[PDB]
């Protein structure tokens, strides 16, 4: 928290900040000037301040120009061309000066106004001084410093330098320099693990090729250059083993520097180069194995260096030493099996850059070894044993080094040797001098119940209680939660503390307790206060604190509707009876005719069928059933009522009624017989001819006759010969008597072809004439041989109707006409829709005892898998963000004292596959859904008939059951509206339905973009609600704005689903999800709150954040990690614009509609396919994913293999992020390997 305090200081009191680096400059100028443009803005002439940012010179004038202009609204004057504006006179001044905010200047310039005297600087409120340490000298800042101090009122100068410690005399000069900045600025100074000094003892070779390398390289001197020098300094470090293997690497490229070398006198030079360099190369004769060592031969250093590690980041100097001590470690490792914790990595044209970014992806292996420009801009994680063979030559190198040892119990230790030792600890007495004065200038236990209760509490203890819950509250890498407090020193002695705990907690009041004393005993007590009242409000306890899967799967029964059951008419009850009405209203279109046969009309048959139905059935829509003729509207319509039988007449009925279902259409499977008294469904199907009647003369001419069961005898004799009655054959149902005996085949009557004759012409080579192919293959004595043959047709075999897809006497004639057949034909596809439409209404009036019509219940009930006209996608999506929007808005309006974290967990486990399996089982929805494929013979199982499974029962999955309890919230959504799907949510069971100038000073900004994207709030509070982060700690009227972000993220969701589903183009299930998931992306709002100036309102103070926020922002006006605040605070702002219009959705949908509009358009018009989907589609046999691989750090890895391709992993927060990361990333190399 010191960047923080620094801040807080700055605001209370003018400052010296000394950042390390100019970005920590800029983050401090912007974030401070931003705090105060409540007091730059104005309208009137005296009642507005302005800030001025005096630069050093001309160059730095665009940088913070640039800072200011895109993260703040303030509009930003500059004015750096010393002539240009020496040129100027005292009419523009004053109108640039009222023109701008913000001005940036030079210090001559600066000056050069003040003489003037057109900017006083009684109106500039920050004065800025850039390099401000220049002041010591005759720098023109002085002036400007000694006008300031001869003026009474002075604005809050914030000095702002990086040139101070950094002195030899600092012991003393730092203190002089340090006292003379305050008395010149008139402002005070403000500025923001254990040494082991290790010895080394000397080692020489027993030999002295050492020395000898010392001869031979000063010889080189006495007569390229570059190598020279990078030879001795390796050399020097180590056995000659490593040092041989760097000096191969060096001939290697040195053998082709020399082909590539311009200069053929450099060249002849490095080819003797060559021959000095090859002394090392010849000189193997004076050590042994390099791969069989006994360390007798190494370097002391190495020495330490492996008995610390036996006990137990390396920063270095040159790449060699690096590489060198990265391959001894190896080998010792090698060589020594003890040193278990041996794991070494190492760091230091565009390729090999990006490998350095991959090999700090690695930063797992403890051991990072790395170069001397690791010291800054890494974040390098938390070391416990930091080994330097060096020491810090400077001291801003010492300290920022020595800080990241962040361990409990530290060592950072310095590798010296034993005479240079004395000059290590003097130079780290120094610097243990300077940072001692620098960082001096910067400077009744609790019970609930003593018979049980809680552990007994300590007073020690209550401050670590309050400091673990601020733990436990959520917080993002951005943000520290930590509590505050401030003694209140009195002049009694006895002081109290105020403890402000974290923005988020609900204890958004001031804590404070007692005075006392001591600061531990007040301390203490503040904390056990607190504590206190956080057990009361109800966050402390008394401690002081697989279903819906896929792959389950069961057998339900079936769902026969509760209107015909036990419906069999009988006599001494009336009976309703329903005519089957047919239109066909779409012949089939000539062009597709690939039969060319004309259409049989069957709406103009005095003939049909009907239903005599004792019981009842409620009246159902008529729906449409694809014949050979096209399509025929069906429609159950009653025709009489109140009317009995006699028991002969039922008997009579009966047995037509399984004649129909056992001869004509033969559904009779042996698994079936017959049972109407015994089956769960019995009503009858009866004939209705115009006299509607139930023609009982046809019934008794159709069972009268000797042809019920087997083709019957024929009448062909030579007195009394068959004739061709040409009238018996107009309208008839052919079966052939010489073939498919006891199984017999039926045609119909196409035409008669006159024309054609038994002795005409015969199609087939092997006959002439028809009379000859009987006679030939089925030796047929045909008494006649003159006759008009007749054209035939098969009858249709198919039974799924649901979606699109002769010689007279030698055959006898069905009873029934050919249009009964055909209408028959069209029967148990009718029979399927009414139960299935029964089903559906049953389903309708259960849950709305107005409702939504029975057709779309039923599609709402069908799975993808019956491959019907219908599906379920669309609803489902629909319905799930009903669901989910729902469930957010009461869990927001019911729990407002529990944070964002609870509200998750809750409402996860509300909207979970788990719960929604169970709530749908509970309405027995399992027993209602249409999955398999219509197949009669199959699955279905006819009135009147029971098994004497796959007839009664249905395998579904749980998830299925969670598709279709939101498939019917999404079909209430679509056809009654919201309160209808609010109660239907309920009826399932869930129970989804029942300061003043510190805003004024913290809202005021905000009047443009208000203006921007055309509304205006009632209650400002909500904006600060919206653009406030969990850092900005200098808000306590309102929370953080991650509450609202929840429902606000909810609220986009569903609005941009309803938009897509309501498209005149009709997209499909799998663009739907396409532009949901492209559409819902945090990067996609992230793009949009930084295209339409979000950026320049947020409000947080970290600075990390800021520099990300700079990039992305940076990045979005030329056209990268993107940062989540930008898309989390788009989200906010759309829930504030929710709960300030008094619950509207209307009012978003009209403030957000103009900016995603675009968005939507490009993607509608080109809909980006999924990265997994279309490496999964491009790749399906060889790419393969790994399942999700917990990371040590939580996150979440994915591997996936493209077999003979390569191998590609990804990490993200989520495994559907990971994966899409890793397919990306497939797809990319795939792409670009293609």
């Known amino acids: 928290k010191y960047q923080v305090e620094l801040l807080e200081a700055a605001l209370d009191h003018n400052t010296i900040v000394c950042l390390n680096t100019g970005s920590g400059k800029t983050f401090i100028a912007v974030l401070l000037t931003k705090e105060l443009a409540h007091q730059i803005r104005g309208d009137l002439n005296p009642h507005a301040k302005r800030t001025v940012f005096l630069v050093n010179s001309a160059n730095q004038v665009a940088q913070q120009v640039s800072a200011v202009r895109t993260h703040s609204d303030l509009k930003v004057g500059e004015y750096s061309d010393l002539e240009v504006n020496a040129s100027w006179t005292k009419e523009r001044w004053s109108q640039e000066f009222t023109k701008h905010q913000v001005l940036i200047m030079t210090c001559y310039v600066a000056l050069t106004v003040l003489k003037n005297g057109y900017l006083s600087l009684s109106d500039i409120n920050l004065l800025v001084f850039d390099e401000c340490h220049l002041a010591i000298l005759d720098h023109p800042y002085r002036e400007i410093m000694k006008l300031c101090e001869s003026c009474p009122s002075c604005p809050r100068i914030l000095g702002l330098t990086a040139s101070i410690l950094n002195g030899k005399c600092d012991p003393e000069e730092l203190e002089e320099k340090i006292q003379k900045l305050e008395r010149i600025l008139r402002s005070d100074a403000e500025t923001a693990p254990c040494e082991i000094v290790v010895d080394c003892g000397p080692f020489t070779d027993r030999s002295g090729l050492y020395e000898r390398l010392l001869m031979e390289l000063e010889a080189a001197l006495d007569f390229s250059k570059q190598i020279l020098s990078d030879c001795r300094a390796v050399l020097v470090v180590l056995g000659p083993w490593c040092a041989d293997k760097v000096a191969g690497m060096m001939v290697r490229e040195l053998q082709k520097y020399i082909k590539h070398e311009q200069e053929e006198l450099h060249r002849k030079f490095l080819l003797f180069t060559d021959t000095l360099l090859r002394k090392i190369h010849a000189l193997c004769e004076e050590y042994f194995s390099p791969a069989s060592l006994d360390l007798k031969y190494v370097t002391p250093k190495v020495m330490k260096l492996l008995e610390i590690l036996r006990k137990y980041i390396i920063f270095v100097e040159r790449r060699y030493t690096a590489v060198v001590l990265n391959r001894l470690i190896k080998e010792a490792g090698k060589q020594d099996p003890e040193l278990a914790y041996i794991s070494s990595n190492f760091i230091t044209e565009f390729r090999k850059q990006e490998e350095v970014l991959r090999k700090f992806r690695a930063h797992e292996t403890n051991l990072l070894i790395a170069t001397s420009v690791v010291e800054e801009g890494v974040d390098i994680p938390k070391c416990n044993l930091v080994v330097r063979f060096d020491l810090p030559t400077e001291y801003r190198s010492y300290v920022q080094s020595k800080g990241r040892a962040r361990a409990p119990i530290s060592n950072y230790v310095m590798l010296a040797d034993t005479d240079k030792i004395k000059s290590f600890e003097e130079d780290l007495k120094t610097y243990k001098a300077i940072e001692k004065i620098l960082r001096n200038k910067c400077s009744p236990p609790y019970v609930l119940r003593p018979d049980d209760g809680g552990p007994r509490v300590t007073i020690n203890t209550a401050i670590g209680h309050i400091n673990r819950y601020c733990a436990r509250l959520p917080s993002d890498p951005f943000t520290h939660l930590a509590p505050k407090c401030r003694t209140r020193e009195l002049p009694d002695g006895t002081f109290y503390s105020t403890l402000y705990l974290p923005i988020n907690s609900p204890l958004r009041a001031s804590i404070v307790g007692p005075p006392m004393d001591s600061v ?715």
């Open 520 to 1234: 531990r005993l007040a301390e203490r007590v503040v904390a056990l206060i607190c504590c206190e009242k956080l057990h009361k409000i109800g966050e402390l306890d008394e401690h002081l604190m697989r279903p819906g899967s896929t792959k389950r799967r069961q057998c339900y029964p079936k769902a026969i509707p509760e209107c015909l059951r036990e419906s069999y008419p009988k006599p001494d009850q009336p009976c309703y009876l329903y005519v089957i009405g047919m239109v066909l209203t779409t012949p089939l279109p000539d062009e597709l005719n690939f039969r060319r046969r004309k259409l049989y009309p069957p709406e103009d048959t005095t003939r049909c069928f009907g239903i005599l139905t004792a019981k009842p059935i409620p009246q159902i829509p008529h729906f449409p059933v694809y014949t050979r003729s096209g399509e025929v509207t069906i429609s159950i319509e009653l025709k009489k009522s109140g009317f009995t039988l006699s028991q002969q007449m039922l008997e009579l009925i009966t047995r037509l009624h399984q004649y129909i279902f056992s001869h004509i259409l033969r559904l009779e499977k042996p698994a079936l017989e017959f049972k109407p008294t015994g089956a769960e469904s019995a009503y009858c199907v009866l004939p209705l001819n115009v006299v509607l009647d139930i023609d009982f003369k046809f019934m008794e001419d159709i069972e009268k006759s000797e042809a019920r069961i087997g083709i019957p005898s024929t009448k062909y004799s030579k007195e009394t010969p068959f004739v061709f009655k040409l009238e018996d054959y107009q309208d008839a149902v052919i079966i052939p008597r010489y073939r498919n005996f006891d199984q017999p085949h039926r045609f119909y009557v196409a035409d008669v072809y006159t024309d054609l004759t038994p002795l005409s012409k015969f199609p087939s080579p092997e006959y002439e004439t028809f009379a000859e192919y009987y006679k030939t293959k089925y030796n047929l004595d045909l008494t006649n041989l003159n006759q008009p043959l007749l054209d035939v047709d098969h009858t249709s075999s198919r039974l799924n109707l649901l979606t699109p897809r002769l010689v007279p006497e030698l055959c006898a004639i069905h009873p029934i006409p050919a249009s009964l057949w055909r209408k028959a034909v069209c029967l148990p596809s009718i029979l399927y829709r009414l139960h299935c439409l029964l089903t559906a209404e049953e389903l309708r009036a259960q849950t709305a005892s107005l409702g939504p019509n029975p057709g779309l219940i039923l599609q709402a009930l069908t799975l993808s898998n019956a491959s019907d006209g219908f599906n379920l996608e669309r609803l489902e999506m629909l319905g799930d963000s009903f669901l989910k929007h729902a469930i957010t808005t009461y869990l927001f309006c019911t729990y407002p004292d529990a944070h964002e974290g609870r509200l998750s967990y809750m409402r996860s486990k509300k909207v979970s596959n788990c719960n929604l399996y169970r709530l749908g089982k509970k309405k027995g929805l399992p027993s209602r859904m249409v999955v398999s494929i219509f197949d009669p013979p199959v699955n279905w199982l006819p009135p009147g008939y029971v098994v004497n499974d796959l007839h009664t029962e249905q395998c579904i999955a749980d998830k299925s059951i969670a598709d279709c309890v939101a498939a019917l919230l999404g079909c209430y959504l679509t056809s009654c509206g919201e309160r209808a799907a609010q109660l239907f949510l309920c009826s399932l069971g869930l129970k989804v339905l029942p300061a003043e100038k510190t805003l004024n000073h913290l809202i005021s900004g905000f009047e443009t973009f208000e203006k921007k994207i055309n509304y205006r709030f009632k209650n400002k509070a909500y904006l600060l609600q919206a653009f406030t982060h969990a850092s900005y700690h200098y808000n306590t009227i309102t929370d953080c704005y991650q509450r609202l972000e929840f429902l606000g993220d909810a609220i986009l969701d569903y609005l941009i689903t309803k938009h897509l589903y309501e498209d005149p183009r009709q997209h499909s299930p799998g663009v739907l999800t396409d532009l949901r998931s492209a559409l819902v992306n945090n990067t996609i709002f992230a793009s949009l709150a930084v295209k339409y100036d979000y950026h320049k309102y947020f409000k947080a103070v970290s600075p990390e954040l800021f520099h990300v926020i700079d990039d992305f922002v940076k990045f979005q006006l030329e056209k990268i990690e993107v940062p989540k605040a930008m898309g989390d605070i788009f989200a906010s702002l759309a829930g504030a614009i929710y709960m300030d219009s008094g619950m509207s959705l209307e009012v978003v949908w009209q403030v957000y509609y103009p900016m995603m509009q675009p968005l939507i358009e490009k993607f509608s018009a080109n809909v980006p396919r999924s990265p997994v989907r279309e490496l999964l589609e491009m790749e399906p046999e060889t790419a393969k994913f790994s399942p999700a691989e917990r990371t040590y750090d939580g996150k979440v890895r994915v591997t996936v293999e493209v077999v003979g391709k390569g191998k590609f992993k990804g990490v993200g927060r989520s495994y559907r992020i990971a994966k899409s990361a890793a397919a990306r990333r497939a797809l990319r190399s795939l792409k670009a390997n293609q």
